[PDB]
């Protein structure tokens, strides 16, 4: 799982044009480089070590527990490439990990506790995973899909009439985020602007994997008094006040 991340991290710095990660410390103090990457399960193959492979008295490495930890992927990154002493906030968001990660990563920089942040998500696919996803009847029932005459490539069909269960996948995604000011001084490429990132619980439920409409609270605004235009929206107004 970490191997996924390491490659993803390196290639991201290459996509950022940063060949030597130490170059960051020309501009930025050691304490201002954050790693807010996270997972939903983490060291799944390490757990196969712990619960199963030990029980079978197969030879397993002593420190397999440390590879089971979710935060240690981010640690290996900092332990092999980064050498930062900056913050580290490793989120769990089983499916929405990456978004949560971005939210935090932003919030780390808006404090000024970090100026550059490594961000994104990762999870692996293993034996016990697929079976438990199977027992929650969440994944696509392949045998039923073969009965419907479907081929592998077309088994993931979002917003479809005939949609039935998802397709479990492995891999890792990494993004690098900065203060615009710093980004412009470093002469790094700029791919876009993170405008808004937020997270949202739902309500009282009795079903865990049931998604809720909570995130609507990105769009909250009051409407009893909407007869006349607000000057707060007008850039003309805001500019003059500055």
């Amino acid at each position: 799982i970490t191997l996924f991340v390491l490659v993803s991290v390196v290639e991201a710095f290459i996509a950022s044009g940063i060949t030597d990660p130490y170059e960051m410390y020309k501009y930025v103090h050691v304490s201002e480089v954050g790693n807010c990457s996270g997972s939903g399960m983490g060291g799944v193959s390490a757990l196969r070590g712990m619960f199963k492979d030990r029980f079978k008295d197969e030879p397993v490495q002593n420190d397999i527990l440390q590879e089971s930890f979710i935060n240690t992927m981010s640690a290996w990154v900092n332990m092999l490439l980064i050498s930062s002493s900056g913050p580290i906030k490793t989120p769990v968001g089983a499916c929405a990990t990456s978004v949560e990660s971005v939210d935090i990563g932003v919030e780390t920089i808006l404090s000024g506790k970090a100026r550059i942040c490594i961000v994104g998500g990762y999870d692996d696919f293993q034996e016990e995973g697929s079976f438990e996803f199977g027992n929650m009847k969440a994944t696509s029932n392949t045998l039923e899909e073969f009965e419907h005459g479907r081929t592998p490539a077309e088994m993931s069909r979002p917003a479809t009439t005939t949609r039935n269960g998802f397709m479990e996948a492995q891999g890792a995604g990494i993004q690098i985020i900065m203060q615009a000011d710093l980004a412009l001084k470093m002469g790094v490429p700029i791919y876009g602007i993170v405008a808004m990132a937020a997270t949202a619980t739902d309500k009282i439920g009795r079903s865990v994997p049931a998604p809720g409409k909570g995130i609507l609270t990105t769009a909250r605004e009051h409407h009893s008094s909407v007869k006349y235009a607000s000057p707060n929206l007008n850039m003309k107004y805001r500019k003059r006040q500055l």
Partner: protein, 145 residues
């Protein structure tokens, strides 16, 4: 040869015409913008018919937004897509609450077998004399020979 192939569960259904209308309109919209499809083409007629067939209120609203919010000044192509657009709107407004139609607007072509200098045999479908619309097709069929 006589082996069973049919089962109930393999049956794929297609019904979401409402969704394809917007997409096919949107595809066409940008194709004109990059200068792939021009005024003169028969594609822009045939595609229109399919959109006019699939006309409902939402599909007007969709067309009303994307056409009324172009800037004509940026490119020659942007003027063209507005002019086509405004006209295409007016048609769809009339064909609303009217049964859709099979109309074929394809160029009537004949066979031409060409033998070059080296004796290579080439076949190509060529525009005929006097038959350029299915109007003139039906007359030709009636008049015999």
């Amino acid at each position: 040869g006589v082996a069973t192939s049919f089962s109930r569960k393999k049956a794929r259904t297609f019904d979401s015409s409402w969704n394809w209308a917007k997409q096919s309109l949107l595809s066409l919209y940008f194709e004109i913008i990059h200068g792939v499809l021009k005024n003169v083409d028969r594609e822009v007629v045939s595609e229109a018919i399919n959109i006019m067939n699939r006309s409902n209120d939402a599909l007007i609203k969709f067309m009303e937004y994307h056409i009324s919010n172009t800037d004509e000044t940026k490119g020659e192509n942007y003027q063209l897509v507005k002019t086509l657009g405004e006209q295409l709107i007016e048609n769809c407004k009339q064909v609303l609450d009217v049964d859709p139609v099979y109309k074929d607007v394809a160029k009537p072509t004949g066979p031409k077998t060409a033998i070059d200098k080296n004796g290579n045999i080439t076949y190509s479908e060529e525009p005929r004399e006097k038959v350029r619309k299915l109007s003139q097709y039906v007359q030709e069929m009636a008049l015999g020979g």
